[PDB]
Ligand binder design. Structure first.
Ligand SMILES: [Mg+2]
Ligand SMILES: [Mg+2]
Ligand SMILES: [Mg+2]
Ligand SMILES: [Mg+2]
Ligand SMILES: [Zn+2]
Ligand SMILES: [Zn+2]
Ligand SMILES: [Zn+2]
Ligand SMILES: [Zn+2]
Lengths: 346, 346
């Protein structure tokens, strides 16, 4: 008989396997917020058609609770729309939010508010935002709203659906407190990398979402994504990968700090899949004649692929109901477990 | 307040990171015994001097509860001998056993019964067995006992210490039930690979250990090692690694079946470190005008290093006190957690 969380925060590190997570224990100043977690599980990430998942089916597993085909956005294997956790939350009087460091129309955020046959339909996904139940969002992707191939001004449609939109910068809570809904579109495409000075966007936007969505003692659901960990993996770029997941761990600390103060909030941290075969290998030293040998004293990150991989992925959970997330299970059970512990009407 | 296990079985898969574990979910017929576990933790594996651990310091962390230098066997970072869980168990009237698919003198088993300044001293390690409290062992390494630089016959010495020794084959339990202590040395060096027909030695020997040590209602501690998973990794040989870890998972099943019936047995499964950067990457195909592309429908295992890596490592625990093993901690705490739940004293 587990406790029942009022609020849920789901943080997704795109492309972070256990090796990526491990880098925070070696390449971050201070202890990782990961260490606050006790309840840990493992998910199997394959899609309905492919051993190696993409981000679209991976996120749809979490958001909708079904295995589906790579590239699907909130649709089942037969392409029909399926009810998402955000749509359920709305029907249970729960305020909802989505934060991302990619475009807001990218596969991960999109799976939580849109229904599209293919993740590539990003202008369609943007239009879907205007019909969604979301109360808050923050990310990049201004292009998909204001510079579209179909020349439509979707920004105007957003605002005509009760969204207050800021395209300049994240503000503080008091700035937005009296708005019905709030949207931040802070880049034309993806947000800047950490190495290009994105700073504490992910944490700040998550903290802002929490304050905005908990107005009037309301319960809330938030999904925040460390989107660019995946891109570091694809590029086989260690410093990129490392700086992005270090930022994600900061966001974890933000969520957990709120949850510990609040006492009624479940925080779930997981990834959609691993990418790059990132490995914390021994540093390579080079001698005069003999060239290369391994030095176990230090780490030199290596990669083995430019794409995703099918390893099981760690799930971390803190707060009321967090015990439900231990053991080993299919990725789509994340959805069913959130539904189970919150006791929301399906 | 968790429960107190009477018996402990510690199964060590040498060199198995979560990616290696994940292979059983794709390359083994039927569901992996890993799925029986609910309580899961993670360990950091660095040694006292090295970010990337070797098998000797990694295992000594488990057996003796301290961080020590790579190559150390049952000694602290300052080289002083430290009491092992086997020695502590003996003091508490617990029966003990060690099983491995490597030579029984290899770093992992050695760390549970010997104290040596360097893991390479395997003839010294074999002699250390004679002054040990071990009641049961099974593995390769006959050469270290009978073809030595000092030309001593160590089997004779063991027999004087109440050991019955078998160098022919694993036998039925009825063949050893009345022996005071039992040792099986079934190969000159390492046991054959699974690919070369080792068969169910690891599961069979663990079952034999259990039945033998639990004679007369004595409590027991057993360490059984899937030794050759690591060697598959070093060689970057996917079929080798996979077949060895599938065998290990069978041994997990053997242990769990016993523990579930017994009800007073804690089973802990973990690894000393990862090796080879093993990755369940997408299958690679070639065109013939810019060859390589990915097919996400299938897995093509890959590696990025010939050595170990420093990723955190999953810990699985089942039985009384299993909840003590969740969260994230240093590898050497495995020792302290075992002592905590068993209440085995010093
Ligand atoms: Mg993503
Ligand atoms: Mg770089
Ligand atoms: Mg070993
Ligand atoms: Mg092979
Ligand atoms: Zn992804
Ligand atoms: Zn990707
Ligand atoms: Zn090892
Ligand atoms: Zn090794």
């Amino acid at each position: 008989q587990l406790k029942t969380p009022k609020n849920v925060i789901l943080l997704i590190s795109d492309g972070a396997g256990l090796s990526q997570i491990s880098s925070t224990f070696y390449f971050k100043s201070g202890t990782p917020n990961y260490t606050q977690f006790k309840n840990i599980g493992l998910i199997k990430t394959s899609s309905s058609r492919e051993d190696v998942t993409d981000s679209a089916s991976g996120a749809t597993a979490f958001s909708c609770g079904i295995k589906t085909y790579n590239a699907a956005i909130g649709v089942a294997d037969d392409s029909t729309a399926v009810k998402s956790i955000v749509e359920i939350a709305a029907l249970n009087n729960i305020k909802t939010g989505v934060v991302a460091t990619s475009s807001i129309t990218d596969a991960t955020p999109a799976s939580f508010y849109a229904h599209a046959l293919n993740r590539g339909l990003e202008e369609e996904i943007a239009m879907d935002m205007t019909e969604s139940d979301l109360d808050f969002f923050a990310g990049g992707g201004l292009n998909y709203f204001t510079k579209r191939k179909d020349k439509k001004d979707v920004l105007a449609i957003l605002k005509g659906n009760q969204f207050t939109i800021n395209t300049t910068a994240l503000t503080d809570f008091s700035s937005i407190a009296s708005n019905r809904k709030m949207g931040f579109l802070l880049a034309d495409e993806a947000m800047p990398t950490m190495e290009k000075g994105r700073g504490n966007f992910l944490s700040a936007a998550t903290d802002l979402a929490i304050q905005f969505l908990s107005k009037d003692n309301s319960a809330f659901f938030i999904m925040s994504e460390g989107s660019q960990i995946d891109w570091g993996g694809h590029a086989n770029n260690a410093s990129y990968l490392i700086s992005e997941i270090n930022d994600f761990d900061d966001a974890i600390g933000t969520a957990l700090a709120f949850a510990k103060k609040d006492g009624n909030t479940l925080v779930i941290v997981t990834s959609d899949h691993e990418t790059g075969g990132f490995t914390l290998a021994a540093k390579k030293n080079k001698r005069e004649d003999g060239s290369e040998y391994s030095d176990y004293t230090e780490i030199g990150p290596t990669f083995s692929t430019g794409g995703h991989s099918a390893t099981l992925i760690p799930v971390f959970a803190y707060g009321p109901g967090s015990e439900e997330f231990i053991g080993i299970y299919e990725n789509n059970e994340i959805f069913h477990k959130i539904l189970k512990v919150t006791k929301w009407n399906q």
